[PDB]
Design a protein around this ligand. Structure first.
Ligand SMILES: *[C@@H]1O[C@H](CO)[C@@H](O[C@@H]2O[C@H](CO)[C@@H](O[C@@H]3O[C@H](CO[C@H]4O[C@H](CO)[C@@H](O)[C@H](O[C@H]5O[C@H](CO)[C@@H](O)[C@H](O)[C@@H]5O[C@H]5O[C@H](CO)[C@@H](O)[C@H](O)[C@@H]5O)[C@@H]4O)[C@@H](O)[C@H](O[C@H]4O[C@H](CO)[C@@H](O)[C@H](O)[C@@H]4O[C@H]4O[C@H](CO)[C@@H](O)[C@H](O)[C@@H]4O)[C@@H]3O)[C@H](O)[C@H]2NC(C)=O)[C@H](O)[C@H]1NC(C)=O
Ligand SMILES: Cn1c(COc2ccc(C#N)cc2NC(=O)C(C)(C)C)n[nH]c1=O
Ligand SMILES: [Ca+2]
Ligand SMILES: [Cl-]
Ligand code: NA
Ligand code: NA
Ligand SMILES: [Zn+2]
Length: 802
């Protein structure tokens, strides 16, 4: 109950919210049906429209008007945005040449340049080129400021998850807004776009920018605008707040537009009806810039023009129905659309089985337009598993398609021609970023980057210390003229041991067998001391950022950091030049495993456990196929280069090592490779401690990895070989799930040349993703600046076309 009979007189768009049942005058009041009786009359004036005209110039103030053209309007901060143009012979901001903004040019009393976040719903990255003729104000921001060709959203590519990721720097799994619709089993409550539950504070985790600002004494304007408050009034309100006295004036502001998303749903991303919404958005930007100019703030404010996600062509006939796959369809609840999430309709049903549901949805029709996953098997790059609000069963839906439970759900609930929500690598889901102002660079294009990075930068722009988040602070320093954040490399926690020859062959009882000169002996000793290490370890050894016990092992063809706790390498590093040759494993060495006389039997794996374990086989991290000489090849069969592998996974790994590494070396002019195991049994994206491992090679203490990574680095200028590169680097990486079957790949009964590389592309990763998962820190010794290295570590190779 609200006693909605107070008044909004003097209080219009009040920045502090009043405690009910006192009536409200803020933007949220509409959403609560709690506005004072006179809110519309006083706060939403519309009389005479939105622009000054010739005959309105110098008028006598009439407080009923939507905006003013009187002489005193500037001092009041309530002129229509085109006032100076029409009445004082000024030019529109868009018609002025751009001029570098080298320093902030602000009115006296401004302690820092204000930040304005101009957020646009459904604004697809390609609209910047394709709509350029009809968006002159936006094209001026873009060409005169700092811009990316596109910005990567988070998964799922829905509105609330992405906007709250912008605000917090967090993945949806950590902030808690994991979809547009959600069930939380602990609260036993549901969250929906329509309705009241979404206003409850318990849904919203992390610390958004407006709270970060307030806690540190920086004032914030509203981030939320009621849908019925027209766009012209939102702009005028911001311009009014910027006229407040120094002690009352916010330093950060947000504008939001429901377009072009609203129209894109109805007409598709490029429908002829889409031109008008893009024109209208551009006119709004023009109004802000004209308004800032009148206030002498157009060379003072930093403006961010940013989208939440793009928009794809999707129609009703492109729907798959779970009723075409499942017999028990009424015993499940589906969260439907451009992704799928499945749980049991009733917790009292103990005959519901997720295994048989997954199997009934796996590779059943020749062109099936979704793929089922247990959430922990989703590509790690999506970071979409560590939340109780994310159902165990997930469906990744092909772009252009929907999934629904039964046909009745579609025709009893074609309307739409566009939708979004798909995998965040998809080109149609990419969105926009432009920064313009004294703190951003002038006429600068930067590479594409992820929206999780922006919170840190908005904190930098406002002099705030960011709350802990998933950005990599410093990776976006190249966007900025000043206010850069100067990070230091993390300190190494554990130093390695460097073991020499300490054990005789006969001390090993591992059940392993193998069929195995003064010039050529001084040679082998130097290799084991690290003589070729400069060739195989190009960027320094990785630093271990947790407490553990490990050894560095040198060899002719590779170097490794070998964990005495996990009984295998944490990392193995090797360089393959363009000229390198592939050989095979000779017949007499097919099942050869050799004890490592630098490492105790007690800290070694054993062959008998693999013989005993009927499900589990083994592979090698440095591939024997790529040995430099028949004698160097013996090093590759050391028990210290061995790792546990399911036979189904060995098909993948063997093709990567035998075919793909040489292919990359030919195409990239040499590559440096770092490979290793990952253990993430609790699917939190972070390295497991040893007490978290759920599976071992039968009857041993050899832990089974959940994934295998590789990081593949070369020269960005590919006329220079990987091992002699003078400038910036180029990287691609992956995190392959270590699975006992290939059910994920529907063509896997075919030759590896038809499906393996496609699997690897799906599981593409950032170096930073691997760092979180292993507790290692890479690229410690290069000739490059640390900020440049941080940008490299956040890079994702997506394999999408242009
Ligand atoms: C992306 O960036 C984020 C942010 O940096 C990273 O997430 C952090 O990860 C930290 C390490 O896992 C984690 O630290 C833990 O914090 C626990 C206290 O958490 C509360 O306080 C914080 C700070 O204010 C708050 O943010 C948290 O909010 C979470 O929980 C509520 C829901 O209840 C949500 O509203 C909110 O959205 C958020 O949820 C997310 O995080 C939780 C985990 O915290 C997930 O479960 C959710 O799914 C969701 O993803 C909390 O309100 C603290 O209790 C922990 O301490 C335990 O572990 C330590 C190890 O050091 C041990 O020594 C202690 O004994 C203790 O263990 C005890 O509890 C165990 C479990 O009950 C029990 O088994 C033991 O026996 C012990 O009794 C721990 O320090 C931090 O909370 C989050 N922060 C956020 C915002 O998510 C994230 O890792 C990054 N991702 C990647 C891939 O890099
Ligand atoms: C969506 N929306 C808005 C604008 O909301 C925003 C604009 C910019 C940022 C940032 N950074 C964040 C939000 N919102 C959020 O983060 C939510 C998820 C709490 C709503 N007004 N009206 C309306 O429907
Ligand atoms: Ca983990
Ligand atoms: Cl959703
Ligand atoms: Na076996
Ligand atoms: Na298969
Ligand atoms: Zn939408």
């Amino acid at each position: 109950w609200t006693a909605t009979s107070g008044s909004c007189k003097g209080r219009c768009f009040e920045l502090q919210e009043v405690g009910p049942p006192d009536c409200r005058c803020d933007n949220l009041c509409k959403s609560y049906s709690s506005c004072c009786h006179d809110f519309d009359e006083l706060c939403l004036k519309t009389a005479r429209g939105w622009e000054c005209t010739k005959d309105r110039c110098g008028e006598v103030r009439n407080e009923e008007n939507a905006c003013h053209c009187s002489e005193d309007c500037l001092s009041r901060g309530d002129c229509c945005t085109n006032y100076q143009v029409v009445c004082k012979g000024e030019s529109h901001w868009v018609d002025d040449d751009c001029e570098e903004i080298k320093v902030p040019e602000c009115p006296a009393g401004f302690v820092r340049p204000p930040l304005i976040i101009f957020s646009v719903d459904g604004f697809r990255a390609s609209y910047m080129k394709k709509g350029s003729k009809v968006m002159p104000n936006i094209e001026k921001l873009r060409s005169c400021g700092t811009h990316a060709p596109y910005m990567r959203p988070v998964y799922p590519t829905k509105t609330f998850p992405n906007l709250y990721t912008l605000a917090t720097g967090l993945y949806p799994e950590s902030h808690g807004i994991v979809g547009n619709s959600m069930y939380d089993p602990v609260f036993d409550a549901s969250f929906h776009l329509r309705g009241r539950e979404k206003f409850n504070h318990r849904w919203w985790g992390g610390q958004p920018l407006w709270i970060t600002a307030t806690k540190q004494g920086v004032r914030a304007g509203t981030f939320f605008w009621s849908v019925s408050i027209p766009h012209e009034r939102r702009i005028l309100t911001i311009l009014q707040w910027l006229s407040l006295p120094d002690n009352e004036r916010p330093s950060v502001y947000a504008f939001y537009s429901e377009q072009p998303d609203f129209s894109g749903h109805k007409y598709g991303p490029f429908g002829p009806e889409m031109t008008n919404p893009l024109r209208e958005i551009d006119k709004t930007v023009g109004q802000l810039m004209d308004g800032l100019k009148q206030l002498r703030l157009h060379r003072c404010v930093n403006v961010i023009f940013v989208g939440d996600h793009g928009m794809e062509d999707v129609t009703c006939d492109r729907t798959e129905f779970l009723s075409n796959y499942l017999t028990n369809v009424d015993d499940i609840t589906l969260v439907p659309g451009t992704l799928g999430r499945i749980r049991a309709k009733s917790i009292n049903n103990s005959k519901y089985d997720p295994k048989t549901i997954i199997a009934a949805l796996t590779c059943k029709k020749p062109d099936q337009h979704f793929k089922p996953y247990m959430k922990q098997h989703l590509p790690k790059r999506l970071h979409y598993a560590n939340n109780r609000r994310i159902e165990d069963i997930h469906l990744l839906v092909d772009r252009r398609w929907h999934v629904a439970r039964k046909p009745l759900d579609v025709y009893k609930k074609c309307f739409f021609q566009g939708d979004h929500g798909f995998d965040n690598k998809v080109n149609s889901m990419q969105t926009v970023f432009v920064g313009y102002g004294p703190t951003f660079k002038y006429r600068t294009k930067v590479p594409p980057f992820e929206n999780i990075e922006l919170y840190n930068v908005m904190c930098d722009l406002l002099g705030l210390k960011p709350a802990p988040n998933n950005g990599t602070h410093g990776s976006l320093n190249h966007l900025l003229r000043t206010n850069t954040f100067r990070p230091t490399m993390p300190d190494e926690v554990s130093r390695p041991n460097y073991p020499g020859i300490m054990y005789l062959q006969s001390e090993f009882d591992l059940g392993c067998t193998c069929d195995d000169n003064k010039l050529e002996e001084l040679n082998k000793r130097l290799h084991t001391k690290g003589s070729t290490k400069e060739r195989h370890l190009l960027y320094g050894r990785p630093a271990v950022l947790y407490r553990t016990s490990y050894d560095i092992l040198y060899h002719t063809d590779f170097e490794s950091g070998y964990s005495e706790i996990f009984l295998m390498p944490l990392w193995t590093s090797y360089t393959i030049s363009k000229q390198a040759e592939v050989s095979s494993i000779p017949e007499h060495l097919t099942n050869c495993v050799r004890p490592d006389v630098r490492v105790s039997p007690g800290f070694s794996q054993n062959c008998l456990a693999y013989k005993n374990d009927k499900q589990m086989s083994y592979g090698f991290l440095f591939p024997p196929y790529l040995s430099s000489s028949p004698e160097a090849k013996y090093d590759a069969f050391l028990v210290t280069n061995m790792v546990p592998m399911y036979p189904a996974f060995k098909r993948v790994w063997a093709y990567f090592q035998r075919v793909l590494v040489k292919k990359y070396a030919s195409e990239r002019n040499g590559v440096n490779v770092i490979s290793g195991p990952i253990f993430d049994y609790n699917y939190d994206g972070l390295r497991d401690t040893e007490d978290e491992i759920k599976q071992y090679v039968e009857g041993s203490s050899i832990p089974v990895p959940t994934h295998y990574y590789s990081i593949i680095t070369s020269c960005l200028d590919f006329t220079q070989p990987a091992d002699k590169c003078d400038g910036p680097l180029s990287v691609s990486s992956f995190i392959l799930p270590h699975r006992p079957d290939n059910d994920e790949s529907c063509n896997s009964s075919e030759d590896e040349s038809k499906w393996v590389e496609e699997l690897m592309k799906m599981h593409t990763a950032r170096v930073r993703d691997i760092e979180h998962l292993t507790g290692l820190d890479f690229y410690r010794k290069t000739s490059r600046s640390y900020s440049e290295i941080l940008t490299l570590k956040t890079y994702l190779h997506t394999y999408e076309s242009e």
